[PDB]
């Protein structure tokens, strides 16, 4: 969450959290910037609900598409980049970072996927930069008429509106593996 | 405590230049952003310029564009704005504004400095 | 987002002319020069891609070059061996977009003409 | 990008209710802040992000609304609340502030 | 040039009535055709979504038909601004060829 | 008068074959049109249920088509008695206007 640099949409990063206590109080509390939507779980009970290997995935996408990072929603971001599982059991935090992630010249670091042969499966990432061919003539290894590079840049700029300004989302997925419980958060601690 | 303290403000003739300073005490200067807000005599708060946490981001209001340069010095705990092309409208009480916007815990424009009077006339 | 097109001036036959269109509101990446033809519908003169690969109309092949100035965001079209048929109104347009070849934001265009 | 405050001046007494409205040219989507400049002092942020009250602001001040129209309502205008409240769009870059309502005593 | 043709050469249309336009293709460009709208003294702009997915930025008025060599465009409500020239580009292969076109 | 027209002006029909009739509307009477049947020297009687709900008192022969400005009537089996004049009234607004009409 407090990281200085954040991953692009095509290479959405993942960080497994395991064998450890997790504090969700720092998150969730003070909810104005966030758009906490806890699909599949109790937002208040995240502290008491124990999962087997909590995962966290972080990317920067325009604020219009924070919605497409939802179970069962179809759009360029979730049919070609990050697809959430129908049985998603994790929250989807998101916030506004125009100041941290934008520059007057226009940040072009973040890139997005506009062409994949078929919709990607749940929690799946493809980082290959290979050309996409819709034409009968083969791609030939160079992007060309009817062949498209899979990564177009996100043109962030400072004066842009709330809808198109950069928003950073950390989709904290949780998995109930038949594995022994690892991420558990309760303490309470009363005096003897 | 948080004590951004303005300084360096004094009478300046038109077309000449001046520099101003803020001295944060009690907070980490680098993470928090810095902006400049001027209250013209008998009027309302007006934004001036913005520099980010790194010092890598520069944005200026149309009136101060090309006339004011915003510099952050995280090592010395000081944010300075050096006005260059002074004009009659400049008279004001420039103040320093902290901002934590963008970091998920941000409280926008939370702390404002006392401010130092700035005037312009021959 | 409007595109500033210039260099649309009458030129002699067999001559070489450069058409310069400044591009604003988006980075030049995939762009083209569709030409509106007087007395006819739109026809295609030249196209460019983000990679820098360039494809040209068979009639204009070998006589036209299109390049992107990264610093100035300006398309450059050089026309050689100018002929009455080749001369026409020209526009700077995004060459292709999305799943298949979308020509979308079209500048007001320069009317390029040849005369002896 | 341009904000307007409807009650340019108002008159009130202890325990009275006041509404001040800030409307933007384009939707600012929950990014608005109400400031309270007292006479001869630097401003103090009162509400941020439309409704999330800043810590240290009395509960009597409350703010509401999202999108183009937002408002700030004080159920009791106690003597400490006479000051010129202002609004500002925090995440659009040419940041702009309204003229403000100068609340006054009858 | 690809064998691109349109029918009819001219369209005569009363106000607020159904109007249909036709175009022809010979490489059997499959499901790759696009439509553009221009009025006199105007720079033409996008009409059909060029087969990218579904028509975008437009209401139910415009009709998306174009499978194999057969494509049609019909709009039931003819608003006064709507009457204009209609051109169809070729999406099958470069060089792309725009259709001769027909106006209201 | 509302812009009510019918096509064709005359119908030529062989026995026991599909026959279609057309009518025109300009206030875009939505889904409000009715059909009537008359033979020479007879008082005309109800044909279509006048859009009340679904055609009533009639078998699958008659066809109910009439959405927006587009309406059609077709019957596949032309019995000798069936050939007659067909008129369509206007249901959009008073005064109601009956169509010019066309016979078999």
Residue numbers in the entry:
A (entry chain C): 342 to 533
B (entry chain N): 1 to 122
C (entry chain D): 2 to 117
D (entry chain O): 2 to 107
E (entry chain J), F (entry chain H): 1 to 104
Q: What does the literature reporting this entry say, word for word?
A:
Overall, a broad spectrum of potent and distinct neutralizing antibodies can be induced in individuals immunized with the SARS-CoV-2 inactivated vaccine BBIBP-CorV, suggesting the application potential of inactivated vaccines and these antibodies for preventing infection by SARS-CoV-2 circulating variants. Notably, the broadly neutralizing antibody 6-2C was less competitive and did not compete with the potent antibodies 10-5B and 13-1C, indicating the recognition of distinct epitopes by the antibodies. Structural alignments showed that 6-2C or 10-5B had nearly identical binding modes to WT, BA.1 and BA.4 spike proteins.
Therefore, we utilized the cryo-EM structure of the BA.1 spike bound with 6-2C and 10-5B Fab to illustrate the overall features of antibody recognition. 6-2C binds to the core with an uncommon epitope between RBD-5 and RBD-7 (Class 3), consisting of residues N343, A344, T345, L371, P373, F374, F375, W436, N437, S438, N439, K440, L441, S443, K444, V445, P499, T500, V503, Q506, Y508, and N343-linked glycans, which has slight overlap with the ACE2-binding site. 10-5B binds to the residues Y449, L455, F456, N477, V483, A484, G485, F486, N487, C488, Y489, and R493 on the receptor-binding motif (RBM). The S477N and E484A mutations in BA.1 and BA.4 affected the formation of hydrogen bonds of these two RBD sites with 10-5B. The footprint of 10-5B largely overlapped with the site of ACE2 in the RBM, resulting in competition with ACE2 binding to the RBD via steric hindrance, providing the structural basis for its neutralization of SARS-CoV-2 WT and Omicron BA.1.
